[PDB]
Amino acid sequence: MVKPEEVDKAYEVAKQRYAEIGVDTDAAMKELEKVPLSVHCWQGDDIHGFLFPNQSGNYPGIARTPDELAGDMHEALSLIPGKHRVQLHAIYAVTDKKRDLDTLEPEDFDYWIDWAKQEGVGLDFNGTFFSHPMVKDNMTVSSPDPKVRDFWIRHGKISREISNYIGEKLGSQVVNNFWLPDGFKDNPIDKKTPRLRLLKALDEIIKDPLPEKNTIESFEGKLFGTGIESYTTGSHEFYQNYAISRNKLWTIDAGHFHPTEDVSDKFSAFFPFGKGLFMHVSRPVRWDSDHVVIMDDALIRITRSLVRDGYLDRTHIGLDFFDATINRVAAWVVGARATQKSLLQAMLAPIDQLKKDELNADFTTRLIETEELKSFPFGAVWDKFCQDHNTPVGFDWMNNIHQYEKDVQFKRDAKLV
Amino acid sequence: MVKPEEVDKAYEVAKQRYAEIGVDTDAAMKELEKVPLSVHCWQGDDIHGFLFPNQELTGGIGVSGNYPGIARTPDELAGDMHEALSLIPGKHRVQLHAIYAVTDKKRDLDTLEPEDFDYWIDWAKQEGVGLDFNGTFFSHPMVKDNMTVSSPDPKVRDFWIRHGKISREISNYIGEKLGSQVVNNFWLPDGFKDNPIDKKTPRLRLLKALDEIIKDPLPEKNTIESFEGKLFGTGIESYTTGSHEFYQNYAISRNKLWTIDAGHFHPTEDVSDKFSAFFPFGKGLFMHVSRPVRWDSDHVVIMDDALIRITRSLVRDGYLDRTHIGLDFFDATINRVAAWVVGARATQKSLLQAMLAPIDQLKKDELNADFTTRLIETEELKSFPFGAVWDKFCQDHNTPVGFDWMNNIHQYEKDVQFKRD
Amino acid sequence: MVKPEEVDKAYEVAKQRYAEIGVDTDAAMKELEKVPLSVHCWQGDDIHGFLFPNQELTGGIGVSGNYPGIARTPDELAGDMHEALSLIPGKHRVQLHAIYAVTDKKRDLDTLEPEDFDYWIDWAKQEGVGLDFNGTFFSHPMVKDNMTVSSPDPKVRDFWIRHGKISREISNYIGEKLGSQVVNNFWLPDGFKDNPIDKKTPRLRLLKALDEIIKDPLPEKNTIESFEGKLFGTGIESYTTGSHEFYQNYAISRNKLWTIDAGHFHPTEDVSDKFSAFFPFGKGLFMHVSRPVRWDSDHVVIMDDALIRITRSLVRDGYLDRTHIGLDFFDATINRVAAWVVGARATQKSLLQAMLAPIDQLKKDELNADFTTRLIETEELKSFPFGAVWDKFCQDHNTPVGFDWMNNIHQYEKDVQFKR
Amino acid sequence: MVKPEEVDKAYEVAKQRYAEIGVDTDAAMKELEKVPLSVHCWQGDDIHGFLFPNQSGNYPGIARTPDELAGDMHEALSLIPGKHRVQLHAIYAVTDKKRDLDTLEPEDFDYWIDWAKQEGVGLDFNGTFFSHPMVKDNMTVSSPDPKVRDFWIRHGKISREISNYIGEKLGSQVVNNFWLPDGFKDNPIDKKTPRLRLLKALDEIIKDPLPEKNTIESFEGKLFGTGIESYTTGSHEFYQNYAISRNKLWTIDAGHFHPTEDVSDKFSAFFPFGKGLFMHVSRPVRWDSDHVVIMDDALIRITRSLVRDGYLDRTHIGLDFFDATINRVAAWVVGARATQKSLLQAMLAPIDQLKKDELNADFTTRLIETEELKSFPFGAVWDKFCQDHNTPVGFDWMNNIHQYEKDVQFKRD
Ligand SMILES: O=C(CO)[C@H](O)[C@H](O)[C@H](O)CO
Ligand SMILES: O=C(CO)[C@H](O)[C@H](O)[C@H](O)CO
Ligand SMILES: O=C(CO)[C@H](O)[C@H](O)[C@H](O)CO
Ligand SMILES: O=C(CO)[C@H](O)[C@H](O)[C@H](O)CO
Ligand SMILES: OC[C@H]1O[C@@](O)(CO)[C@H](O)[C@@H]1O
Ligand SMILES: OC[C@H]1O[C@@](O)(CO)[C@H](O)[C@@H]1O
Ligand SMILES: [Mn+2]
Ligand SMILES: [Mn+2]
Ligand SMILES: [Mn+2]
Ligand SMILES: [Mn+2]
Ligand SMILES: [Mn+2]
Ligand SMILES: [Mn+2]
Ligand SMILES: [Mn+2]
Ligand SMILES: [Mn+2]
């Protein structure tokens, strides 16, 4: 185990190193405290949910019930320093009433409201527009089939009713994120009409007013997906236009863009025109592969672009990934800690001074300092943050994962549901 | 040379082949006549212009090549564009840059006057073409660390804002005189070579500066502005102030046009995807067809996946009437007049191939999720006789067929271009 | 229906337009009929095969769709391939996978026997086609953490090395019976989902394992091996043991064939660039034409920039005599028989367009740095009447012209596929 | 100014943090000492050289003379901890004789041999196959014009003679790197014949035997260049095949590959077959832009792939970038220090235990530990390495740059 006095010794020296270049490590840690990550429930059970029984990776101890998933999320959050949020999907409804996506009721989420209050977390929401017989040729809200459209519009309206109810009960705004798989596997003839059907369907979904204090909708675009490679009805351009036009949020999923595309470029082109962002941090490996978030160029750029340009007050940060080849609880902790330490590194910079140097076209100073900061003792500040919030330092949280494996995950498959 | 009887015989067979699948070849040719291409003047003289005799090319863009017979004067450039248009069937437009001002007066970019373009108004009337316009925001000492309108330096900003306002006054004047709306396209090099600390402030400086440029109202019948984003340029690789997102947002919110340059996007990015995401919200597009080869290289437009997708996406979804098609390339390694004709003809034959489809039936098949029929038919149409309809279009419009227009280039080299130096 | 008189008329005018620029359309069609395509059997039944009913499809590759009329028996798949080949002009080849073994004997991948392919030898002789072969290194419980031949587990290695050796023995036996060399294509899923620590040792394990597989000499007249690299697959995104560089190096050093699958490279990567960098050093290519849409998606091959560049690069530089052209794609969202015909006809018309160019003169123009003439002529040729020559080729070889073969597909749906 | 006792105290804590996970920080630093970077001379003077007077950026104080360039490289090396090498280009010949690229003599590099001895560094070499009237339609060695081919073959042979001589005089092998611009702006008809002309020409260049002890050739491919976008004669595949076939080195320039291409993937696909590598670390920003090397995914992957798989003894690491928008001396130090701290981070991992975990398919432990290691105190070990080798720590070397600007660079123009 790392010794707390080792952490304290390293922190005091780091504090002085950063003080010398005009950076306050105490203030940086206070800033990181105020950035909640919205931890996605579906990593815990491979997006099975509880509504439709049996609707990459095979690690033992998949969650199969609300209590198992709740326990798994509690365990992950206990190893993530600070205060965070959880994202639900509609299929994570908890009820003994037989339900379809178009018959869900707000009370079906009382279980998660009660859990969030106990855990001390806010809730965000996602309608479920996939893994259903009413998905017709990969289309839902914008299907050419009006019976398919009507079903999914009913689900869309219900997602808002649920989100409103949850926000009212928790006293914290629910971001209700819309992702639709709608598109074509192969080259379409008509690109226009599907997007006009989508526009009309979304306007119908958001028509009935609900208090902004309780909920607001965000719209998640995508470039391509498996079996839907050639055309995505809900493009990034369509949804940025839709969010600005209809005064809603825009969702940027870091895995959903072109090869070499830097999603950190988008923030400063959106905020002159739009309300707010839901930033889904996700690692794409050559496609929308939904790898666990790690400290890489994309995450460093996303986090430093939000910090440097002061956008955190208008950006809701969520995780989105699904890796079942590794301990599913550890996946959450890796991704959350990677996001936090990346935010903290960005906060541990003399940003005001670097901005003045850049305005003066002192590109020599900017390059030298940004490169030197990558090997400043940011780890010492991160370790101190972990310790101050009663979470294990460095390798030490593997001890907690191994204990959870012995006690829970390695036994669970043989346990009755 | 190709015998007109060969074109007529091939056309009569092609007409029947297309009629058999519910396609009217005569009607398709009538549709192609209604699509003017805006031919860019700067391919003729390697973007030298007339304002600054020996100014070096800056702003993340480069011209490679050394072919004989570069245009050096207004008369030479005008003659070269006349020769290119004589080999491009139908009626088209020409794009000017501000540096193509024709005056005996000492001008800078902030002292240009509308009458400095009387030469081009007179030429356009005699040629029977419309004019589009581009402010020149590059190759100038007042470009400071690759920035212009959005420079943090108020002196630099003010100079370039004055040029922007003048571009609108010039464009309005040309539009009034020609009785045809002048699209005034704005392209700025503004950005950073290396990674910026502040991405927000440059884009707020750009927003405020553009609003100042467009503040004074001018009749839409004479001119409307379009805004051209870029991902990266040479010496400006890491950040572009005027991004595609920024300008799509700007155009929609300020009721202006959005410029899509096919060379200015990510690897594998399909700009034909953008039209149907734009038109539920926005007014119109200026499409700059340009061939990127692994960077914004401004290669001559050829019949490739990008051009085919651009053209068929505009035809299939009925966007031609809200989309101005402009050319943008500069290849100096080849006959500069031939460069124009290759790119223009590539664009036209690609539009025509898209028009020669049973689009209403293909749309119904797709609505019924008949993806088998869609794949079979779209693939068969790629080897239908679209060339026979293209040749007939060329012949009907008094332009050479196939390889024949090379004879015209060789004669123009002999009589004009090769005599110049 | 297309009137044969329309085809004949269009062809006579096309023949003259091409003759005017020094191109012989009759000679172009003779050249095309000498290029066989190896039609992959696995498009017919969504790569189910016959060895293991209902085994889940694994190995970084997926099939989307549920169009009616899937083949479920050897006889159904054989009939479906017969129907596709009947609509593709000229004479071609078929690729088998090991899992397409036909036997009432209990078999695993390490106990397959050459005689388990007698069914396909008989079919190939009756159909009049050559056969190529692929070992099946996926969709099996012995695939351990996405690794087979180069697994760190010796038991897994030994199982897959036995399958590798058997693929060669089966291929040798087919080649002997058919009197036509079997290209035996090796594709392994081996790799990691996430970032590896050790990139060296897996590739040394692969090198050793492949050397063991090919150790026992077999007659070159009967079979030769080809090795197929990949950049990434689903669930194996971060590292592929058998990289393109590994296999080009391996093919050259061991005097085997290199397999280029057009779907298996980087964004913007032009696989037609590789031929002229390989042939100064290496023996032969197996070119797997496949359409990737933003991943190794195995879309049906269409006439696009990639296919046009592949076919014209092989034609212009005279590499066809050393290049085996195979199809690889699986699209179950459409008529599976139609999928074959679309991809095969796209490939043939693209080869033919490449052959319909004054290549000798264009090369001289290029040698003289006449880039103006090269650009004008290559662009004009894209709208020459290549379709008239293609139509003449289809008609001369007793296949429907243009949209007409849709009638055959609709008749086959009504009479066969929709009855299953 | 960072206090040495601040560095020593941070180091002692880091040493213990690393010891706890089976990593020896003293040994990691000894391994870093053994990895020389070949610093490219041409960043100092914007690739002008001295052979042909004036044939992105305009920062003041460009080197214009051998003495100026030599002094600039001395300053950069004084701020890069440990012992390194310098790469020359043929156009950096120092002679009062009238020379062309096909008439250079080994003695024309006596200036640089003498400088390298004084500085205590080895020299690598690059033939200059660009910026010359004999470049015909962007082709040199593989031009269809036999007069052009013969001119560039003479230069190629002379590059080997110069390299052998430098190698003999310094007692250190000269890696003689060959980069040719040869290719086409637009789509070629014949891709085969240019590459056969290249094969025949390279074989003529390397025909005359020279001792590997003094010099070995390396071959640098490229995907595309400005004005040469559509076809490159010397492709990566061509040169990997050529290097393996002819028993020479293969040059991997990190800036010269496809979008998303990870050049760290190539090493373990090459070394079962080939002799050695020349690794040109370079930052591409959406093209072969030759940005200064920084600590990014590419550099982290290149350096950890070399140290994890033990390829450093067969891999020569060179810098290749040109940024004239910043202090040119600072450009070298940023790139070199980025490379060194990235190598050091890779060396500060429990590589044997991680290999064991991965062999055992423990992908959970591998993800957790590799991610934790990114925020271990690698900076404390880097700062100790800098201080132990008499170079400034962190921001402090900016003082040295500012002083060199006042005293030298800002006095030139
Ligand atoms: O990115 C998404 C779809 O690819 C979605 O936001 C979530 O991952 C989805 O709701 C669950 O897979
Ligand atoms: O695309 C552009 C620059 O990249 C511009 O529209 C034109 O190229 C410029 O106005 C002239 O080069
Ligand atoms: O490309 C391949 C896998 O990615 C293989 O050649 C074939 O697709 C496989 O053998 C059948 O899926
Ligand atoms: O990569 C290169 C050219 O793009 C070369 O190695 C060097 O940059 C050249 O020798 C000097 O510019
Ligand atoms: O993991 C230990 C052994 O168990 C197995 O037999 C099955 O996992 C492996 O192949 C090893 O030999
Ligand atoms: O290690 C001492 C130096 O000696 C060498 O010059 C080799 O002779 C290396 O380049 C080092 O820089
Ligand atoms: Mn998402
Ligand atoms: Mn995703
Ligand atoms: Mn443009
Ligand atoms: Mn461009
Ligand atoms: Mn394949
Ligand atoms: Mn594939
Ligand atoms: Mn290099
Ligand atoms: Mn480079």
Numbering used by the authors:
A (entry chain D): 1 to 55, 64 to 425
B (entry chain B): 1 to 421
C (entry chain A): 1 to 420
D (entry chain C): 1 to 55, 64 to 421
Sentences from the paper on this structure:
L-RhI is one of the enzymes involved in L-rhamnose metabolism and catalyzes the reversible isomerization between L-rhamnose and L-rhamnulose. The overall structure of LrL-RhI is similar to the known structures of L-RhIs.
In the complex with D-allulose, D-allulofuranose and ring-opened D-allulose were observed in the catalytic site. The bound D-allulose shows a ring-opened structure. The catalytic metal likely moves between two positions (Mn2A and Mn2B) and is refined as alternative metals Mn2A and Mn2B with 0.8 and 0.2 occupancies, respectively, considering the electron density maps and b-factors. O1 and O5 of D-allulose are recognized by Lys230 and His97, respectively, and Trp187 faces the hydrophobic side of D-allulose. In addition, Leu57 and Ile61 on the flexible loop region cover the active site and create a hydrophobic environment along with Phe138, Ile47, and Phe330 orienting to D-allulose. His97 recognizes O4 of α-D-allulofuranose instead of O5 of D-allulose.
